[PDB]
Amino acid sequence: QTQEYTINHTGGVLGDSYVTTASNQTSPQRETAVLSFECPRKFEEINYVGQRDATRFVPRTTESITGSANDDTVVDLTANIQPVAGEEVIAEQDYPVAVAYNVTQGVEVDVVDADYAADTVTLGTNPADGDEVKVWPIMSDGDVQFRLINQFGQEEGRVYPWSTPLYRWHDFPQLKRGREINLHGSASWSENETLEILLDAPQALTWEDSDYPRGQYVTTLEQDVEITL
Amino acid sequence: QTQEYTINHTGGVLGDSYVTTASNQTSPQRETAVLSFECPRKFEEINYVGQRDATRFVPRTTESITGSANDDTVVDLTANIQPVAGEEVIAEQDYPVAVAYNVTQGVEVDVVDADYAADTVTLGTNPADGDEVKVWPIMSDGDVQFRLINQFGQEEGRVYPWSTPLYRWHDFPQLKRGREINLHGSASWSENETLEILLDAPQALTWEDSDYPRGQYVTTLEQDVEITL
Amino acid sequence: IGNNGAEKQISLHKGQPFIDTQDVGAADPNTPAVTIEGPSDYVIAIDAGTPVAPEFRDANGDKLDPSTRVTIQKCDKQGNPLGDGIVFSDTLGRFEYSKMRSDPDYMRKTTTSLMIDEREIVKIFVEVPPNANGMDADNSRITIGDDTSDYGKAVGIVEHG
Amino acid sequence: PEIGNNGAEKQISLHKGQPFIDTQDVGAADPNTPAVTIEGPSDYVIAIDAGTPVAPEFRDANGDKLDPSTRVTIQKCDKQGNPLGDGIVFSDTLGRFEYSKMRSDPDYMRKTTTSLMIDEREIVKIFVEVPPNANGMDADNSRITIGDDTSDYGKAVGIVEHGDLSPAESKAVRQ
Amino acid sequence: PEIGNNGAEKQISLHKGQPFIDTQDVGAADPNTPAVTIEGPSDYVIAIDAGTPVAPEFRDANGDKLDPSTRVTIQKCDKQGNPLGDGIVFSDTLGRFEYSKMRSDPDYMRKTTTSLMIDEREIVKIFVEVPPNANGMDADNSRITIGDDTSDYGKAVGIVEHGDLSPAESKAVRQ
Amino acid sequence: IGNNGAEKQISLHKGQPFIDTQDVGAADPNTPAVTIEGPSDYVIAIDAGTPVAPEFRDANGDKLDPSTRVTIQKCDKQGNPLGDGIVFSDTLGRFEYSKMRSDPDYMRKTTTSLMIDEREIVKIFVEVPPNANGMDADNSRITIGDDTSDYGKAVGIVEHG
């Protein structure tokens, strides 16, 4: 009867219809709904348990600059920054804190290091004047949470009262049992009822850019759940 | 009554007299006696136990080159080489695999890396022509063992029949309990009786050079023992 | 020699007769990238805490989009899947292939037990998002079970006769 | 929809971005002030067990770690910023954490010494002793965390609404 | 002087620089040969327990690790280089060791599967399967080690002189 | 507040009244680099598995010759040493000061138990080989016991009254 699956921000067991993504909002700090999963017709019910079900959620943002004659090799940012689980070094991390891509030169761009104290990052390359650039740094200073919807956009409850910060979420090394993250709360729902994963943070996150090298979908969520067939 | 001390290749509890050091021999491969400790007048007896008493023994050798106009930045060696417990990287090791010193420029010389497969090592600096150099690389391809002497240069027995290779000795990360080295055998002696620590290997090791930066005495031994006052 | 027990311990991989693979493009869930079959008069057993380890690659020798999904799944005869008995519905990300098999922490195990009668099938479906590179069978590898190791488990096998 | 009636003794943790906590910069040779202040919210009761993890991760204004001879002291207080000798916990040095793996590793995870409790209106302070001729603390980058939610290792901070339980007042008087 | 009468069951380990062991280079797609051969010395008996550590650390001629899809198989043999199916142990892949920390770490320490014994004149072989279009093995840099002396972790290879014990022949026939 | 037990747990260091240090040159065993004394009407207790951690330095801010030796040693009153009761006759090498206090593996403990009556002394003798640099007390530090940690131990203290 019961199984233990993973569910992702796209498709998976659902089929890309009863998922929906969305960005947050910047100027009004508000508890937006960045993702939501609706139980399809075919399942009987879905469960969700804390301290039983593992999780992963790698968000990012997007920013841009303008090429100049001066040898920049460094860019400021609008988002608080830190390393992935802490380290000054690049390529030792579980994943890159930041990625950069040049529109003109359709190539990746490495990263040397950064201050990780102010909103700063180094670039290893020397961008030319007029060249367009994009960057997908780490995100910080946010809160994440869950809530349930009974087919109508009509809340009935909340999985767990207190929000967990995405900041801390990046801080812990993920994907290690014993050190794996496990939120609290014990939810369950049935056909056409929705779980919404909600965000409260200033910086504008992303889901799709169509010019990101390390995979198509920039960010990701991967959550464990229990299903009754 | 009983204590648990450390004893070193110099002085310590003994007093620099009832120690004696010595080098090995190269052309006749022979079980030389590189170190020996004679129980002084004042003690009652000394014990020694395997799987109870820890140990450390960092040997090296010496070689020299001649400066040339060509930018060498690399030297071959006459000794098998490997990293300290294995790694391609320098300054992560428990200690440097190799040290170099320039006679003219009375300064240390860093190390970048090495092949660690053939008798090879890199130098980070660019020695000048005619400049004299010394190097104290790691040692390999040897055997170490123990034996007892009853005041006369007259053996009575052997602590443990089978020799342990110094090669392996360098391979294990030292100074970690659980991973600490502990030979076998249970020896004990009394006044003016000697324990000899013996070496069988080709390459000429050293004890003193008077121009080595990282301490005066190049090599070292540090063994745990039990003493009856 | 000491007579070893019939319940022998083995580990699976590509270079075997009762396994097969075939290339995959993009957005092709029904196609199994890898197929396994029970040999004749043998019985295979896979416990719940059995390690798992795919190493799919791109034709150019690169890892794929970690949003990609992998699903091991038991099947009735005639290539027919089943809902029950499925194990390891995981993503292609979050393995650390460098330290995957070596570190028990990064080692991933299954969820529930499993059994393979003499003539049965186990498939490994893959879901790649579109506008992505396809799988290349020359570079891909699978391993399940960790023989000769203290951690993890090993796949049991026994002769039916 | 269905949600489970989770127990009142909720398992939680503390950090900078909360209302009942505050911080402020610190100079050098400067014990008396709380670099970080905590206070009990209204009609709640917090409980910190003896095996509770602890994790200060202070910084310098330029983004550096400080002199590890620096000292940190958590300390309970009576009301009115009035410290007390008994009930003190976590008199530690600022060094010897290895912030990289600190919370991450149960080994590095430094726990408290004795139990602790916070009645509805009480204070817990975090004094810091920096040696002179050193750099000061910067509140923008500093941080405290205590308790270990979201991990089989470590413990978590207990909380309960005072209005729910009848012996909540009894435990408050018990301290 | 005084030495303790250590037990006959001596705790030992195997490596390249010994008389009763040998090796020779290997090419590619080349199972049949022992890259390394071991033989029982005369009037001795070796014993290898089931929880014995194992540690091949082969190399390439240029000083590199080989294709981790490569396979290693320890295997007992009857006399005359005659292998046997039963009694085989350590059918492992050349990858997934992390040679840096392999012996060092009990985690990485890969042990055998079942017990083993070597009568006075017997053979144990180490076959290697390299996929084609790959680099060959180089005996100068390759190495085997088994057993873990000198560590509270791991096990050690037992040895005994056959002439000392009376049931040594009984255990030899027992295999 | 919960009444804490009299057997309080503490850790020792330089900046205390009942401790002192003084510079050292070379080949000076009799001179204690560091002196400790029992305060009045208190009793200190140091168990056998107590961590130890010296961090002696050179005047220029460098570590000394690891062949250097350190010896903690109890002393009768009047600065008088004793053979019995000594603990931690160790070398100045083999600590890895970077990971010394943080890693329990590199953490070094004592050998046997110890006790300090109200008026007693514990000294820390140092043996440096000649033609070496001397000790500088400004940079040196000592720590014993590991308060606020799961591994290691802590120095017990109790009021005699």
Query: By CA distance, what is C100's nearest residue in E?
Result: E96
For B19, phi and psi rounded to 5 degrees?
-100, 155
Q: Which residue has the tokens 């009045």?
A: F40
Experimental approach was cryo-EM
Distance set, CA C38 to CA A27, A134, C46, C85, D7 (Å) = 60, 51, 12, 16, 49
Distance set, CA C20 to CA A53, B224, D26 (Å) = 33, 58, 66
Token pair for B143: 């055997």
Token pair for E62: 């240029």
Q: How far is the first Cα of chain E from the last one, in angstroms, to the nearest whole number?
A: 39
Contact E97 C99 (CB under 8 A): no
Specify whether the backbone of A130 is left (phi greater than 0), alpha (psi in -120 to 50) or beta.
Answer: left
A131 and A118, same domain (yes or no): yes
Rounded Cα distance, D143 and D23, in Å: 9
Name every chain A residue with its beta carbon within 8 A of the beta carbon of C94: 56, 174-175, 222
Q: How far is the first Cα of chain F from the last one, in angstroms, to the nearest whole number?
A: 22
Name every chain E residue with its beta carbon within 8 A of the beta carbon of B179: 104, 151, 153
Grouping H, G, I as helix, E, B as strand and the rest as coil, residue A226 is strand
Token pair for C73: 């799944």
Q: Which residue has the tokens 């034709």?
A: C59
Rounded Cα distance, A214 and C65, in Å: 7
Smallest CA-to-CA distance from C107 within C161, C56, C54, C35 is with: C54
Give the start-end residues of each E strand in A77-172. Answer: 100-102, 108-109, 120-122, 132-135, 143-149, 155-157, 164-165
- Amino acid (one-letter) located at E30: D
DSSP state string for chain D: -EE----SSEEE-B-SSSTTEEE--B-SS--SSEEEEEEPPTTEEEEE-TT-EEEE---BTTS----TT-EEEEEEEETTTEE-STT-EEEEESSS--TTTTTT-TTT-EE-SS-EEE-SS-EEEEEEEPPSSSPPB-TTT--EEES--SSSSS--EEEEETTT-STHHHHHHH-
Grouping H, G, I as helix, E, B as strand and the rest as coil, residue F103 is coil
- The alpha-carbon gap from C100 to the nearest alpha carbon of chain A, in Å, equals 11
A201 and A222, same domain (yes or no): yes
Q: Which residues are CB-contacts of E97 (< 8 A; sequence separation ≥ 6)?
A: C102, E55, E56, E57, E108, E110
Q: Are C22 and C42 in contact (CB under 8 A)?
A: no
The parent domain of residue B113 ranges over 60-139
**Domains contained in chain B, number:** 2
Contact A157 D3 (CB under 8 A): yes
Smallest CA-to-CA distance from D111 within F145, F103, F150 is with: F150
Token pair for B113: 């890396």
Rounded Cα distance, E111 and E95, in Å: 15
B112 and B148, same domain (yes or no): no
Smallest CA-to-CA distance from C102 within C150, C33, C135, C160 is with: C150
Query: By CA distance, what is D96's nearest residue in F?
Result: F102
A195 and A146, same domain (yes or no): yes
- The alpha-carbon gap from A163 to the nearest alpha carbon of chain D, in Å, equals 10
Q: How far is the first Cα of chain D from the last one, in angstroms, to the nearest whole number?
A: 39
Confirm or reject contact between B38 and chain E (CB < 8 A): no
Q: Are strands A19-21 and A164-165 parallel, antiparallel or unpaired?
A: unpaired
Query: By CA distance, what is F145's nearest residue in D?
Result: D92
Token pair for F113: 């138990």
Contact A86 D103 (CB under 8 A): no
A42 and A74, same domain (yes or no): no
Grouping H, G, I as helix, E, B as strand and the rest as coil, residue B148 is strand
Contact D93 F1 (CB under 8 A): no
Confirm or reject contact between C117 and chain E (CB < 8 A): no
Q: Are B14 and B7 in contact (CB under 8 A)?
A: yes
Rounded Cα distance, C46 and C155, in Å: 5
CA angle F110, F113, F119 (to 5 degrees): 110
Query: By CA distance, what is E61's nearest residue in B?
Result: B117
Tell me, in Å, the resolution of the deposited structure.
3.8
Q: Which residues are CB-contacts of F68 (< 8 A; sequence separation ≥ 6)?
A: F56, F91, F92, F93, F126, F127, F128, F129, F132
Name every chain D residue with its beta carbon within 8 A of the beta carbon of F148: 54, 90-92, 110-113
CA angle B114, B118, B123 (to 5 degrees): 30
Q: Are A169 and A103 in contact (CB under 8 A)?
A: no
Residue where one domain finishes, among candidates B139, B172, B187 = B139
Confirm or reject contact between A92 and chain D (CB < 8 A): no
B205 and B168, same domain (yes or no): yes
DSSP letter for A176, please. Answer: -
Rounded Cα distance, E28 and E135, in Å: 7
Query: By CA distance, what is E119's nearest residue in C?
Result: C1
Rounded Cα distance, B141 and B34, in Å: 16
- Amino acid (one-letter) located at A1: Q
Token pair for E101: 């920390």
* Alpha-carbon B113 to chain mean position: 22
Rounded Cα distance, C89 and C112, in Å: 11
Contact D115 F13 (CB under 8 A): no
B55 and B166, same domain (yes or no): yes
Name every chain B residue with its beta carbon within 8 A of the beta carbon of E151: 172, 178-182
Name every chain F residue with its beta carbon within 8 A of the beta carbon of D113: 9, 147-148
Residue where one domain finishes, among candidates A99, A121, A139 = A139
Name residues 72-91 of chain A within 8 A of C (Cβ): none
Q: Are strands A46-49 and A220-228 parallel, antiparallel or unpaired?
A: antiparallel
Contact C13 E175 (CB under 8 A): no
Rounded Cα distance, C55 and C64, in Å: 10
Query: By CA distance, what is E153's nearest residue in B?
Result: B178
Grouping H, G, I as helix, E, B as strand and the rest as coil, residue C49 is coil
Distance set, CA A93 to CA A118, A211, C98, D100, F64 (Å) = 20, 23, 13, 12, 35
Rounded Cα distance, D58 and D53, in Å: 16
CB pairs B-F closer than 8 Å: 52
Contact B117 E62 (CB under 8 A): yes
For D64, phi and psi rounded to 5 degrees?
-145, 165
Name residues 23-62 of chain E within 8 A of C (Cβ): 54
> In terms of DSSP H, where are the helices of A64-210?
166-171
Q: Are D89 and D116 in contact (CB under 8 A)?
A: yes
Name every chain B residue with its beta carbon within 8 A of the beta carbon of F96: 94, 175
Confirm or reject contact between E19 and chain B (CB < 8 A): no
Token pair for A108: 């990746």
Q: Are B53 and B225 in contact (CB under 8 A)?
A: yes
Name every chain F residue with its beta carbon within 8 A of the beta carbon of B9: 67
Rounded Cα distance, C100 and C104, in Å: 8
Rounded Cα distance, B209 and F154, in Å: 43
Residue where one domain finishes, among candidates B139, B171, B203 = B139
Confirm or reject contact between F129 and chain B (CB < 8 A): yes
